[PDB]
Amino acid sequence: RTGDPFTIDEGGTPSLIFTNGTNGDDSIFDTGAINNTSAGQVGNFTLNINVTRFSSATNITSTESIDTFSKRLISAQTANSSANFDVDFAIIDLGSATLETLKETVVDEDNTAVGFNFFNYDVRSLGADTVSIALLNTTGNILPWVNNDTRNVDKNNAILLVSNSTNSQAYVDLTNAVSDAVYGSTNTDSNVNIGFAMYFTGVGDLAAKEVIVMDFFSFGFTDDGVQSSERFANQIIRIEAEETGDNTSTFEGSLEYVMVNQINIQDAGTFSGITPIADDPSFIVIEDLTDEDAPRVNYNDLGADGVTTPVSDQEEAPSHSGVVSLNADSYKIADTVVITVEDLDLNVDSDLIDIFTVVSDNSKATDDAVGSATTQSLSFGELGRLLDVTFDDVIWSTPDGANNTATGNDSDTCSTELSNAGITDTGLGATGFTLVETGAATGVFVGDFQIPSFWCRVSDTTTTPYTYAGDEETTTGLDIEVNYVDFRDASGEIVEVGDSAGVRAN
Amino acid sequence: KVYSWTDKVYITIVAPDHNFDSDLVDEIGETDSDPIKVSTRGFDLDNYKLVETGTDTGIFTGEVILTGFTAHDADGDGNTGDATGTTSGSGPTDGLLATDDDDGLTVSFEFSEDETIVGSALIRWNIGEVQWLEASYPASGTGVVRVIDPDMNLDPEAVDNFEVDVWSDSDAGGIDLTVTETNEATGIFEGTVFFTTLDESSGHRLRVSEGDTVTAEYEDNTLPDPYTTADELDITATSLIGT
Amino acid sequence: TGSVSLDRTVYPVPFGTIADSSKAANAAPNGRSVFPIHATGITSTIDSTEELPTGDLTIHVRINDPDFDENPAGEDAMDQDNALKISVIRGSDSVVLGYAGASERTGKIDVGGNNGTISNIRSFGEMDEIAPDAGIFELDVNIKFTDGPASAQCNSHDTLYTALDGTTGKADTNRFDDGAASGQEYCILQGDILQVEYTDPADASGDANTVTDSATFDLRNGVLQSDKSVYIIGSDMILTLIEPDFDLDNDSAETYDLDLIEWDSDAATTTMGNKGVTGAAAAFDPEPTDFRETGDSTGIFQIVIEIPESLSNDKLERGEEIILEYTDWGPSGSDYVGDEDEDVNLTIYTSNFGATVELDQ
């Protein structure tokens, strides 16, 4: 576990009931859709129940228990498997939990610099064909549940999370509408009660015990993200270790973590890419984790003396100070120049080679630099910039866009001025320069390109697109520099490092 | 041999005959058969508990915290209740006992029926002692002054702070120096002042000049006989600033 | 028998932003608890972009009690309800910030350590083992600038209070169990005392015991210095700031805005940050973007500055006088951060190696 996930026990021991019946024509389960709109996600929850031929004519009620560390709702029933028996819904009351309890994990996603919400559920034990999950907000009782027709007090009772999915175990990205719905309520958070509702298809029987898992994950930073108190990562990870032999009591698993950089932090792909439940899980590290904050795995245990005593292990996850170097101290025209970056934190996958590419988008401040088109303006600089190359302390960029109309001394613009000289290496983006990891998990990145005879200077860097000069200039007698920005140094903070060399002529 | 109010007492009873079990830490004083009582004039703790150092050592120890009386101003800042007057606890270490300005303490132990052993001590206030660390200072240096008054140890398990007044010839208004305890039960206090020559005296900065004597004074609200509970003697120390 | 130990012996006095005071807008602190940037960068009244973000002290408390190490190869917690107390005392008067040991509860600060019902008071929550086999437990607690005995010195603060309880309010009653006296405010001054007491429910003798550690709040004046006096134009200079006021957290390296420093010369007068004259920020090329500590607990900040060619389209001369000015809001003189100021200066030169002209014949 890291940070504060919102597990199914966040409000104490839940309450669960199963039921047979049909969705109302106004139910979010029949009318909603997952299309990032309030029309689709936000609704109310109404149902008609027929448990009159059920045993003792009551909805199936359960005995609940919660694991100390694995956080798994185990519900004990009377096992029924008859052709008559069937259930359709499950309603959970999450104990004391309210929107105050939920809001300490789920973030706004509109008033946060970088924020993403994720929902993790496992209901494989029910043997359903389709499942639908909705979060329930109300000022009344989750149990007993009431339709809108009887209680005309609330505008909306349900928030749709998953709709008619065929996966009983999934790790999904919530839309903006879900985060917009949680913060949208005008009522104070303490009075509003929260709970889960589920819809099933093909649950024909119940065993003596069944398990349910439901969590909310959150990732991002607030403001600059420079101060440690301003970075957050809330997640829980479960290891499904495998027995080594038949009669060997040894169980084997693995862990791996991805350290966040300035590029992947902006993409929801990196956070949805981890596998939270597996024999080989992965988890996110937002900053250096050592000493008391080192990641630790906990295993609750029944000892030979009969008392339950957990066992645990931790391992630190340091960050590394990156260095960038240039292979030679002097270059000549049309010499191969090779750039290497030794930052171990940039290796995000052990199986695949890790690659970083140059940005070509005239509407973004990270143009002709190694990084991401997605970007933001922050205190330390530009968040989508990882590496760039400069002549005479000026970005080496192609003359393209709307601000390249300057002709200089003559009536020829700098872009056509370069073309007449046969130069195709107009900037770093046009050489095909990429940073390529030497091995699958080496942590060393190498790129190369060839020095051009002419280049076009940037007049003003404060405008997007950049404004280019009207006349080409020789590269001879100018210094060349490479700049690398480490999002995480040995301390977990943002610093820039560089190397320089001289272009010469004879 | 002599204590102060709100001071911490440790008791060691060496009574080998009460080592009943060789593998158990033995307790004395908690029973009608074997009572102990720690008392001052006015207040007492009865059936107090003392415990063995190790299982077969036969040495018993405990500690009590004196508390003084709630109706006083040791600070002299004009709101009373500097030292809460409380009496409670029946453990080896969690004893609280009230006290007077001039008083006596005794510990009684009935090891066998119709025999007792006693240990006694005195409780007296004390005068204050104030001095600068160095006789002469530079015009731009920093000042530290040491004050020694065991009566100002209001909490023996915590570090205590009180305000000394600091002024110079240039500015008679001066400043209020907050001195702090070096250790939780040592009763020695120290504080730090900046010397400015070209600015107003504020907080711990003191406007001074060449050959200007500086003065720090401590008002002793806790003074023993011949003085009374109401007498307020001022102890002060001086140093010259010569470059 | 347990032991308890505090993070540090001496602590900086914390400060706040302008958002905490209800006082009318001004170009100076005007007796508020703020740490403004240098005056040359301030635009009319002080606004959110012209002071350092809110400075909240973070302390760490460790209890070394092996008796809570039930699991010798597994996580544990100090589960003894309200066994740790954190309090701020000034002379006789005391203020108790909260308890630790019990499940966390919304509560208020206690005034005088006197309140009848302990359920009314803030609980920090159960502590956690630093390592599975360590037997040492740690707590992280955040101390704001409003937490201490009421005093007359802080009446200048038109303080709006952070509501510790569930409610949203800026009154002293929302954060403290007792309202402050008229003409007084709750605050921390220089020379105040921070203590933690641990009530060990089982000591070496098998009974209850109380162990304690203490520390003091203090403010110090800054020292500003450089690697060498004379610099060639376009060279890199190392700039060092010794402000112990700024080591709010020992565990992390704290970052501070570069606008605090003043650059004044014949060329231009500027703050060397985002608030300087147009194009001044790019003219210095700071690495990193602003001040950073040289370790977790040093109180020493370093920045690398390139000597500009032309600040404001005016080029620097040889031997030109350059003054670096830092305003230490919270010197030794001040009682709280705000209040008095002291200016610390550094002088540096562009090099002056004369030129010569030679001809062959």
Side-chain angles (χ1 to χ4, degrees), chain A residues 220-250:
Chain A
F221 66 81
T222 63
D223 199 66
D224 42 32
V226 171
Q227 283 68 51
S228 296
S229 51
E230 283 177 272
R231 309 197 260 250
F232 67 80
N234 313 327
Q235 70 198 339
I236 178 160
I237 305 296
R238 277 158 267 209
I239 308 190
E240 294 183 345
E242 302 182 325
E243 183 161 3
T244 297
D246 271 325
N247 193 9
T248 76
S249 305
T250 293

Short mmCIF file of all heavy atoms in Angstrom, two decimals, chain A residues 220-250:
data_model
loop_
_atom_site.label_atom_id
_atom_site.label_comp_id
_atom_site.label_asym_id
_atom_site.label_seq_id
_atom_site.Cartn_x
_atom_site.Cartn_y
_atom_site.Cartn_z
N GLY A 220 -1.15 12.12 -9.10
CA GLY A 220 -0.88 13.46 -9.63
C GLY A 220 -0.07 14.31 -8.69
O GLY A 220 0.48 13.78 -7.73
N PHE A 221 -0.02 15.61 -8.96
CA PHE A 221 0.57 16.64 -8.06
C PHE A 221 -0.32 17.87 -8.07
O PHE A 221 -1.18 17.97 -8.94
CB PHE A 221 2.01 16.92 -8.48
CG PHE A 221 2.21 17.57 -9.82
CD1 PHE A 221 2.06 18.95 -9.97
CD2 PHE A 221 2.60 16.81 -10.92
CE1 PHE A 221 2.27 19.55 -11.20
CE2 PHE A 221 2.82 17.41 -12.14
CZ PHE A 221 2.65 18.78 -12.27
N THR A 222 -0.13 18.80 -7.14
CA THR A 222 -0.90 20.07 -7.04
C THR A 222 0.07 21.25 -7.14
O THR A 222 1.21 21.10 -6.65
CB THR A 222 -1.68 20.13 -5.73
OG1 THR A 222 -0.76 20.12 -4.64
CG2 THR A 222 -2.65 18.97 -5.57
N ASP A 223 -0.36 22.36 -7.73
CA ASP A 223 0.48 23.58 -7.91
C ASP A 223 1.71 23.23 -8.77
O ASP A 223 1.57 22.56 -9.80
CB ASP A 223 0.81 24.14 -6.52
CG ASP A 223 1.24 25.60 -6.48
OD1 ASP A 223 0.42 26.48 -6.79
OD2 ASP A 223 2.41 25.80 -6.13
N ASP A 224 2.89 23.69 -8.35
CA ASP A 224 4.20 23.41 -9.00
C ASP A 224 4.50 21.90 -8.89
O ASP A 224 5.03 21.33 -9.85
CB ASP A 224 5.28 24.34 -8.43
CG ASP A 224 5.21 24.50 -6.91
OD1 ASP A 224 4.81 23.55 -6.29
OD2 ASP A 224 5.47 25.58 -6.33
N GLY A 225 4.16 21.27 -7.76
CA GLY A 225 4.55 19.89 -7.42
C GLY A 225 5.98 19.84 -6.93
O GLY A 225 6.53 18.74 -6.83
N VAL A 226 6.56 20.99 -6.61
CA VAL A 226 7.97 21.10 -6.16
C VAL A 226 8.09 20.62 -4.71
O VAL A 226 9.03 19.87 -4.43
CB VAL A 226 8.50 22.54 -6.34
CG1 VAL A 226 9.87 22.73 -5.69
CG2 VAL A 226 8.56 22.91 -7.81
N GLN A 227 7.18 21.03 -3.83
CA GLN A 227 7.23 20.61 -2.40
C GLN A 227 6.69 19.17 -2.28
O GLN A 227 5.77 18.81 -3.03
CB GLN A 227 6.44 21.57 -1.51
CG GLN A 227 7.17 22.88 -1.21
CD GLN A 227 7.35 23.81 -2.39
OE1 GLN A 227 6.40 24.13 -3.12
NE2 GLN A 227 8.57 24.29 -2.56
N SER A 228 7.24 18.38 -1.36
CA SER A 228 6.90 16.94 -1.18
C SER A 228 5.43 16.79 -0.77
O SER A 228 4.73 15.91 -1.32
CB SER A 228 7.83 16.29 -0.19
OG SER A 228 9.17 16.28 -0.68
N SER A 229 4.96 17.66 0.12
CA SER A 229 3.56 17.67 0.60
C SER A 229 2.62 17.88 -0.59
O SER A 229 1.41 17.73 -0.41
CB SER A 229 3.37 18.74 1.62
OG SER A 229 3.87 19.97 1.14
N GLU A 230 3.15 18.24 -1.75
CA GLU A 230 2.29 18.62 -2.89
C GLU A 230 2.21 17.47 -3.90
O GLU A 230 1.47 17.63 -4.86
CB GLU A 230 2.77 19.93 -3.50
CG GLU A 230 2.36 21.13 -2.66
CD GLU A 230 2.87 22.48 -3.15
OE1 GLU A 230 3.96 22.88 -2.80
OE2 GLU A 230 2.18 23.16 -3.88
N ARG A 231 2.88 16.35 -3.66
CA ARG A 231 2.85 15.17 -4.55
C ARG A 231 2.11 14.02 -3.87
O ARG A 231 2.38 13.78 -2.69
CB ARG A 231 4.29 14.74 -4.84
CG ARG A 231 5.16 15.89 -5.31
CD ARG A 231 6.41 15.38 -5.97
NE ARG A 231 7.57 15.44 -5.09
CZ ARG A 231 8.61 16.27 -5.22
NH1 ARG A 231 8.68 17.17 -6.19
NH2 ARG A 231 9.62 16.19 -4.37
N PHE A 232 1.24 13.32 -4.60
CA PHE A 232 0.39 12.26 -4.00
C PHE A 232 0.25 11.06 -4.92
O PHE A 232 0.26 11.22 -6.12
CB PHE A 232 -0.98 12.82 -3.62
CG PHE A 232 -1.85 13.23 -4.78
CD1 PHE A 232 -2.55 12.28 -5.49
CD2 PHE A 232 -2.03 14.57 -5.12
CE1 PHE A 232 -3.37 12.65 -6.55
CE2 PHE A 232 -2.86 14.94 -6.16
CZ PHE A 232 -3.52 13.97 -6.89
N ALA A 233 0.11 9.88 -4.34
CA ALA A 233 -0.08 8.59 -5.04
C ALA A 233 -0.75 7.60 -4.08
O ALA A 233 -0.18 7.29 -3.02
CB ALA A 233 1.20 8.07 -5.58
N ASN A 234 -1.98 7.22 -4.40
CA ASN A 234 -2.85 6.42 -3.51
C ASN A 234 -3.22 5.15 -4.25
O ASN A 234 -3.83 5.24 -5.31
CB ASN A 234 -4.11 7.17 -3.11
CG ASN A 234 -3.81 8.58 -2.66
OD1 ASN A 234 -2.77 8.86 -2.08
ND2 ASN A 234 -4.73 9.48 -2.93
N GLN A 235 -2.80 4.01 -3.73
CA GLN A 235 -2.93 2.74 -4.47
C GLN A 235 -2.72 1.60 -3.49
O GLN A 235 -1.98 1.78 -2.50
CB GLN A 235 -1.91 2.71 -5.61
CG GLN A 235 -0.49 2.56 -5.12
CD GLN A 235 0.54 2.94 -6.14
OE1 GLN A 235 0.29 2.96 -7.35
NE2 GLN A 235 1.73 3.28 -5.66
N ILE A 236 -3.34 0.47 -3.79
CA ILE A 236 -3.07 -0.79 -3.04
C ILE A 236 -2.75 -1.90 -4.03
O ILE A 236 -3.37 -1.98 -5.08
CB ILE A 236 -4.26 -1.12 -2.13
CG1 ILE A 236 -4.03 -2.43 -1.39
CG2 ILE A 236 -5.58 -1.14 -2.90
CD1 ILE A 236 -4.92 -2.50 -0.18
N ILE A 237 -1.81 -2.74 -3.68
CA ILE A 237 -1.25 -3.78 -4.60
C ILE A 237 -1.26 -5.11 -3.87
O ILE A 237 -0.74 -5.20 -2.75
CB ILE A 237 0.17 -3.42 -5.04
CG1 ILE A 237 0.24 -2.04 -5.69
CG2 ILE A 237 0.67 -4.49 -5.99
CD1 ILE A 237 -0.53 -1.94 -6.96
N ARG A 238 -1.80 -6.11 -4.55
CA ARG A 238 -1.98 -7.47 -4.02
C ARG A 238 -1.18 -8.47 -4.85
O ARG A 238 -1.24 -8.41 -6.06
CB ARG A 238 -3.46 -7.80 -3.98
CG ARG A 238 -4.10 -7.24 -2.73
CD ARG A 238 -5.58 -7.05 -2.86
NE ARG A 238 -5.98 -5.72 -3.29
CZ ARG A 238 -7.13 -5.11 -2.99
NH1 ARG A 238 -8.07 -5.67 -2.24
NH2 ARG A 238 -7.37 -3.92 -3.49
N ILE A 239 -0.41 -9.32 -4.20
CA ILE A 239 0.50 -10.29 -4.87
C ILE A 239 -0.14 -11.65 -4.79
O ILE A 239 -0.39 -12.12 -3.69
CB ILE A 239 1.89 -10.27 -4.23
CG1 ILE A 239 2.45 -8.85 -4.13
CG2 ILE A 239 2.82 -11.21 -4.98
CD1 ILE A 239 3.89 -8.78 -3.72
N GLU A 240 -0.42 -12.26 -5.93
CA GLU A 240 -1.02 -13.60 -5.98
C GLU A 240 0.10 -14.60 -6.27
O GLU A 240 0.19 -15.09 -7.41
CB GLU A 240 -2.07 -13.65 -7.08
CG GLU A 240 -3.28 -12.79 -6.87
CD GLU A 240 -4.27 -12.99 -8.01
OE1 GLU A 240 -3.87 -13.55 -9.06
OE2 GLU A 240 -5.42 -12.53 -7.90
N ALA A 241 0.94 -14.85 -5.27
CA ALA A 241 2.14 -15.68 -5.40
C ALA A 241 1.76 -17.13 -5.72
O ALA A 241 0.65 -17.56 -5.45
CB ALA A 241 2.97 -15.54 -4.14
N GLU A 242 2.68 -17.85 -6.37
CA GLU A 242 2.44 -19.21 -6.90
C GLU A 242 3.33 -20.22 -6.18
O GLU A 242 4.49 -19.89 -5.90
CB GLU A 242 2.72 -19.22 -8.38
CG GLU A 242 1.87 -18.22 -9.12
CD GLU A 242 2.05 -18.18 -10.64
OE1 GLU A 242 3.19 -18.39 -11.12
OE2 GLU A 242 1.03 -17.94 -11.34
N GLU A 243 2.79 -21.38 -5.86
CA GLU A 243 3.54 -22.46 -5.19
C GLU A 243 4.60 -22.98 -6.17
O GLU A 243 4.30 -23.23 -7.34
CB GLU A 243 2.61 -23.56 -4.71
CG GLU A 243 3.30 -24.67 -3.96
CD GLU A 243 2.38 -25.52 -3.09
OE1 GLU A 243 1.16 -25.29 -3.11
OE2 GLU A 243 2.87 -26.40 -2.40
N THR A 244 5.82 -23.12 -5.67
CA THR A 244 7.02 -23.50 -6.44
C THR A 244 6.87 -24.95 -6.91
O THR A 244 7.12 -25.20 -8.08
CB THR A 244 8.27 -23.29 -5.57
OG1 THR A 244 8.35 -21.89 -5.28
CG2 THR A 244 9.53 -23.77 -6.24
N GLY A 245 6.48 -25.85 -6.02
CA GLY A 245 6.30 -27.28 -6.33
C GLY A 245 4.92 -27.78 -5.96
O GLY A 245 3.98 -27.01 -5.95
N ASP A 246 4.78 -29.09 -5.78
CA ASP A 246 3.51 -29.70 -5.33
C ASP A 246 3.44 -29.62 -3.81
O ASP A 246 2.42 -29.20 -3.32
CB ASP A 246 3.41 -31.15 -5.80
CG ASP A 246 2.78 -31.31 -7.16
OD1 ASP A 246 1.88 -30.54 -7.47
OD2 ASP A 246 3.22 -32.23 -7.90
N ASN A 247 4.49 -30.05 -3.12
CA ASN A 247 4.52 -30.15 -1.65
C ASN A 247 5.60 -29.20 -1.13
O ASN A 247 6.04 -29.35 0.02
CB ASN A 247 4.74 -31.60 -1.23
CG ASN A 247 4.48 -31.84 0.24
OD1 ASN A 247 3.97 -30.98 0.94
ND2 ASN A 247 4.84 -33.02 0.72
N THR A 248 6.01 -28.21 -1.91
CA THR A 248 6.94 -27.16 -1.41
C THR A 248 6.07 -26.03 -0.90
O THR A 248 5.34 -25.45 -1.71
CB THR A 248 7.89 -26.66 -2.51
OG1 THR A 248 7.21 -25.78 -3.41
CG2 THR A 248 8.47 -27.80 -3.32
N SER A 249 6.13 -25.68 0.37
CA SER A 249 5.28 -24.60 0.92
C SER A 249 5.82 -23.22 0.50
O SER A 249 5.39 -22.20 1.07
CB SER A 249 5.21 -24.73 2.40
OG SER A 249 4.75 -26.03 2.79
N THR A 250 6.76 -23.16 -0.44
CA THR A 250 7.36 -21.88 -0.88
C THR A 250 6.49 -21.28 -1.98
O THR A 250 6.19 -22.00 -2.91
CB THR A 250 8.80 -22.07 -1.34
OG1 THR A 250 9.58 -22.45 -0.21
CG2 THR A 250 9.35 -20.82 -1.97
#
